[PDB]
Design a protein around this ligand. Structure first.
Ligand SMILES: COC(=O)c1cn(C[C@H](CC2Cc3ccccc3C2)[C@H](O)c2cc(OC)c(C(C)=O)c(OC)c2)cc1CCC(=O)O
Ligand SMILES: CCCCCC/C=C\CCCCCC(=O)OC[C@@H](O)CO
Length: 382
């Protein structure tokens, strides 16, 4: 059993897995659809890679990482192509080395996209707290990041092919993968799922913080209108106190915004002292000066935040579609070794195609969300 010159039939028969010898009706269609999707992945992801390369506006650290994510899908298109060419009766034709090759290329392609989305999540986590994009230094750093993403992918796709397999542990072979160990699949599934959870936390921290600044901005604009209304001294104080409390929370997060909001804190505190003395008319006039202060920075940050949030939402849709299709397949790996006789693993071909379609979903997402990219795709074809 331990690295014997045994065929794939030996491993597949011992575990509760099917092995065909004849050309089945569903095997012809799963191969037929499989290749058709693979050709589309190798064309749609290649089109968006050329689009970022030729267009001047897409020469930024965030868009270079998107091209690498497409390159990972392009590699996946080649990985699933070799898989679909060796499915059904052609599975028997595979040797021990060639089985680990088709399985290895798929494991490499997943962690290539997993580390890419992880790097994009970190990229968006910095740019939101840094307001705008970085300089040329980051573009040189992105090249280094791309190397780290692909190096991690090659290593993660080599770990089961460098000793961690049930070849010399034939009794601890999984029902789904007859050459892969149960201990590896439990580790692999929990590794990719914990990465999905920490990525959700990263965007939840971004959306939560954006919501907190907009809430403080809503409190600042609403209470400003209250002071404008001819009311008593007590009505002016309660509005300014609500503004001072909103400005201190907005402060918690280059030196332009850090020393920008504190100017408003000073102007509100000076307007508050006027109301405490008894000067209601002077307090309303000082609050009118706060309106001209905020109107000077909305032309420097509010116009640029809309383009940032438009790209941020697009990224979450790419990540969202990735979780919804890959999680049932990864949960299936856990139920394969930790749930014996509770449920049959019949839906194995369905979850495979579900994750395969995602490699084609990414250029479709950028086509209807990104305005500049949608016009660039037509320029290449013509
Ligand atoms: C193709 O048509 C099938 O019918 C078919 C199905 N299989 C079995 C496995 C699919 C499961 C469904 C699925 C979907 C998404 C993620 C994981 C999983 C596991 C597959 O070997 C595999 C194992 C993985 O874990 C290591 C992963 C990963 C990376 O998590 C993997 O990436 C999708 C794919 C094999 C075949 C064909 C060969 C055969 O057996 O004759
Ligand atoms: C540049 C030259 C060639 C082009 C690169 C070829 C290597 C691609 C990675 C292959 C992989 O993941 O290995 C699978 C092993 O697990 C099998 O045992």
């Amino acid at each position: 059993q331990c690295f014997y010159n045994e065929s794939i039939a030996f491993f597949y028969n011992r575990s509760g897995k099917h092995l065909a010898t004849e050309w089945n009706t569903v095997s012809k269609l799963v191969m037929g659809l499989g290749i058709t999707v693979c050709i589309f992945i190798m064309l749609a992801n290649l089109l968006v890679m050329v689009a970022i390369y030729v267009n001047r506006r897409f020469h930024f650290p965030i868009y270079y990482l998107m091209a690498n994510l497409a390159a990972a899908d392009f590699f996946a298109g080649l990985a699933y192509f070799y898989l679909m060419f060796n499915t059904g009766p052609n599975t028997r034709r595979l040797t021990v080395s060639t089985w680990l090759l088709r399985q290895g290329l798929i494991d490499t392609s997943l962690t290539a996209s997993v580390a890419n989305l992880l790097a994009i999540a970190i990229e968006r986590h910095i740019t939101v707290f840094r307001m705008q994009l970085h300089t040329r230094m980051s573009n040189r750093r992105v090249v280094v990041v791309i190397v780290v993403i692909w190096t991690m992918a090659i290593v993660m796709g080599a770990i089961p092919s460098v000793g961690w397999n049930c070849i010399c542990d034939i009794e601890n072979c999984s029902n789904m993968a007859p050459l892969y160990s149960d201990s590896y699949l439990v580790f692999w599934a929990i590794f990719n799922l914990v990465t999905f959870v920490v990525m959700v936390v990263l965007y939840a921290h971004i959306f939560g913080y954006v919501a907190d600044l907009e809430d403080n901005w809503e409190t600042l604009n609403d209470n400003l209108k209250v002071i404008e209304k001819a009311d008593n001294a007590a009505q002016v104080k309660d509005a300014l106190t609500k503004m001072r409390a909103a400005a201190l929370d907005a402060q918690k997060a280059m030196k332009d915004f850090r020393h920008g909001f504190d100017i408003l804190v000073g102007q509100i505190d000076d307007a508050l002292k006027l109301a405490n003395e008894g000067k209601v008319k002077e307090a309303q006039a000082a609050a009118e000066q706060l309106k001209t202060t905020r109107n000077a920075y909305i032309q420097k940050y509010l116009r640029n935040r809309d383009t940032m949030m438009s790209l941020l939402k697009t990224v979450v849709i790419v990540l969202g579609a990735f979780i919804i299709c890959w999680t049932p397949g990864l949960v299936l790996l856990l139920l394969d070794v930790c749930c014996p006789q509770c449920d049959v693993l019949a839906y194995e071909k369905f979850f495979l195609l579900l994750a395969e379609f995602n490699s084609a979903m990414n250029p479709i997402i950028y086509s209807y969300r990104d305005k500049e990219m949608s016009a660039t795709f037509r320029q290449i074809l013509g």
